[PDB]
Each structure stands twice: as structure tokens, then as C-alpha cells.
Ligand binder design. Structure first.
Ligand code: NA
Ligand code: NA
Length: 338
């Protein structure tokens, strides 16, 4: 009747769970893997990040499930946020990610809160987080099915990259949300997408530069590091006015390609040998906090070692993920090579 969550807390869970509150909206990605043909049936409220920061995925779900507009928004980042203290939603359980006003309110109101992590250390925590969600939401078989699918598809990569000597690995810099913010070069260090670089057999030039999983590295250090390979992450919508790489469920190959070229033309960045010699790529940013991240691991590996991964097709992996676990068709563009 309890779960131990990813924070190590022990939480009593009701035997029946039908009203789930998503404390971070993009935790919907993880919950979608357990819900089969009825992805929205048990969501009684969600934080605004899914609709506001992933409008493309929201659009694809809305087309198939019009009742998505009836799910109330919480957390004051959109309005639509009709709940403030109005959590008369009668939630059975709420899910958050490891690191806040809403957690404190729920705990005193007696609603069980469960923490997961796909962001800090996805190498260690992606599969435990899915088992925990399967237990807390009473979808254990679905969780086990996904754990096996994920591990099988990571092993396709590590079967090869486990054997590669360290001094034969390309150096890699990933610029998260490239071109979106003012100060340049948010990146991943000891965790987050750094974990994907590691598993794909690359050498993350930021790993020794940051104390934690996410942070900023100044542009002068990126240039001085002279990375073999450059990766930009982003998730902008086609025709958006804010700068950044354009990727997601409604993005075509041509649009993605055209936005990456612009990102690669920024000052400083455009002096990198990786930019000018054909070693530049873009990845969908939301893989930085999603159990779908095996698609980024496979894409990284195929970019780093094209010859050794000629038989590996991340697009087919994504086709399998959707047909086995989801209720929508795959669409759009989630990675691209310059
Ligand atoms: Na989805
Ligand atoms: Na590692």
C-alpha cells in the first residue's frame, strides 16, 4: 500500500487511482506510456508546461481527443489556470519531478505526492521512475513492457559503444535551447543530456565543467574546447518569432533544417570547426525530461558513429514506441543533421 519514490520518500497509495494531477505538465509523456488507448482518461489537472511549452504535441492529441480542453490548468504559467488554491479536483495522487508551492499544499491536504526523475540523471533514474509510476498508478504490466522496450533499445547502442576506447570518442558540446536565451550556452554536465552523450559513446566537453546536471558554460570556453561534434536542442513551433531550433510533432524536415542553419549562423558558434565541417545536429529539447529519451540516445549514437550504426533507425524505434504504447500516430520531426 506504499511506494518508495525517487526522492526516497515513502508514500501511501490508494488501491484505486482514477484522478491524477500532473504537477509538471510534461510528465504527461511518462503517464502516456501506461494509459494505452485512453491517455487522458485519468488526468484531472495539469501544470501548464505541456500545453504552453509543447503546443505541437498538444495539438495532435486535441485532434483525436477534443476533451483535452476540459482538463484544468494549475500553477499560474498560462489564464486557464483556474485552480490556485481551488484543488476541489479531488485528486487521488499527484506526480512531480525531483528538483514548489503546490507540493506543500497537497501534503497538508493529505493527497499523496510521488516524485520521479527523467531530468537530473536519466541514465540511473528513467527505468526506476517508470517502475514507480507503474506501481503508483496501478499499471505495472505496462511499465514492465516499456522498461523492456527501452532497455532493449538502449542495448542496441551500448552493445557497440561499451567497447569503444576513451581516446577514440568524439568530443561533444550540446547547447540546450540554443539561441533562445540571452547569455549563451546552457548545457548538460554530470547528468541530463550528458547521460545520453555518455551512453552514445561521446565525450561531453561540459562534464568536467559543471558541478551538476544542468548549467551554463560561457561561449569562450566552448570555442576553446573545439568540440568535434555540435548539438543544439530546441522545440520551437514553425513560424515562431522567438529564436531557437524548430522541432516537434508539426515540424517538417525542411522547416527543421532551415531553423538549424540559422542557429548555426550565430556569432561565435559559426567559428566552430564542428559547425563548418559537417558535424552539427539538432535534437528535440523535451527529450531532456522524458522517458522517450531513448530516441535521443539512438540519434546521438548514429551521428557519432554513422558506419557502426548504419542498421539502426531511430525513426523505426519511434514507430514502435507509438504503436506499442500510445494512442496517436507519430508525426513531425524530432532530430535533424545539418
Ligand atoms: Na505522446
Ligand atoms: Na555513464
Amino acid at each position: 500500500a506504499t511506494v518508495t519514490d525517487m526522492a526516497g520518500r515513502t508514500v501511501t497509495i490508494p488501491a484505486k487511482v482514477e484522478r491524477i494531477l500532473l504537477g509538471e505538465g510534461r510528465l504527461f509523456y511518462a503517464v502516456s506510456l501506461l494509459e494505452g488507448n485512453k491517455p487522458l482518461d485519468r488526468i484531472v489537472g495539469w501544470q501548464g508546461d505541456f500545453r504552453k511549452l509543447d503546443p505541437q504535441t498538444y495539438a495532435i492529441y486535441k485532434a483525436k481527443f477534443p476533451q483535452i480542453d476540459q482538463i484544468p490548468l494549475i500553477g499560474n504559467t498560462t489564464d486557464s489556470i483556474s485552480p490556485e488554491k481551488v484543488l476541489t479536483l479531488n485528486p487521488d495522487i499527484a506526480i512531480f519531478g525531483l528538483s514548489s508551492e503546490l507540493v506543500k499544499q497537497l501534503e497538508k491536504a493529505g493527497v499523496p505526492v510521488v516524485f520521479v526523475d527523467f531530468r537530473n540523471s536519466p541514465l540511473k533514474n528513467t527505468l526506476p521512475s517508470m517502475r514507480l509510476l507503474g506501481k503508483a498508478l496501478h499499471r505495472e504490466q505496462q511499465a514492465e513492457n516499456y522498461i523492456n522496450f527501452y532497455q532493449d533499445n538502449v542495448d542496441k547502442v551500448t552493445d557497440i559503444t561499451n567497447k569503444i576506447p576513451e581516446d577514440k570518442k568524439p568530443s561533444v558540446f550540446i547547447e540546450l535551447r540554443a539561441g533562445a536565451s540571452e547569455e549563451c550556452c546552457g548545457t548538460a554536465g554530470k547528468g541530463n543530456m550528458g547521460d545520453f552523450i555518455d551512453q552514445a559513446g561521446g565525450n561531453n566537453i561540459a562534464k568536467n565543467l559543471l558541478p551538476g546536471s544542468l548549467g551554463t558554460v560561457n561561449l569562450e570556453k566552448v570555442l576553446a574546447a573545439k568540440p568535434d561534434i555540435y548539438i543544439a536542442s530546441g522545440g520551437k513551433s514553425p513560424g515562431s518569432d522567438a529564436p531557437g531550433v524548430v522541432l516537434g510533432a508539426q515540424v517538417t524536415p525542411e522547416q527543421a533544417q532551415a531553423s538549424l542553419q540559422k542557429i548555426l549562423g550565430r556569432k561565435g558558434i559559426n567559428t566552430l570547426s564542428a559547425v563548418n565541417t559537417g558535424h552539427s545536429y539538432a535534437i528535440w529539447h523535451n527529450y531532456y525530461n522524458s522517458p522517450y529519451n531513448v530516441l535521443a540516445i539512438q540519434s546521438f549514437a548514429k551521428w557519432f558513429y554513422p558506419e557502426q550504426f548504419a542498421d539502426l533507425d531511430p525513426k523505426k524505434t519511434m514507430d514502435s514506441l507509438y504503436s506499442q504504447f500510445l494512442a496517436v500516430e507519430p508525426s513531425g520531426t524530432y532530430w535533424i543533421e545539418a
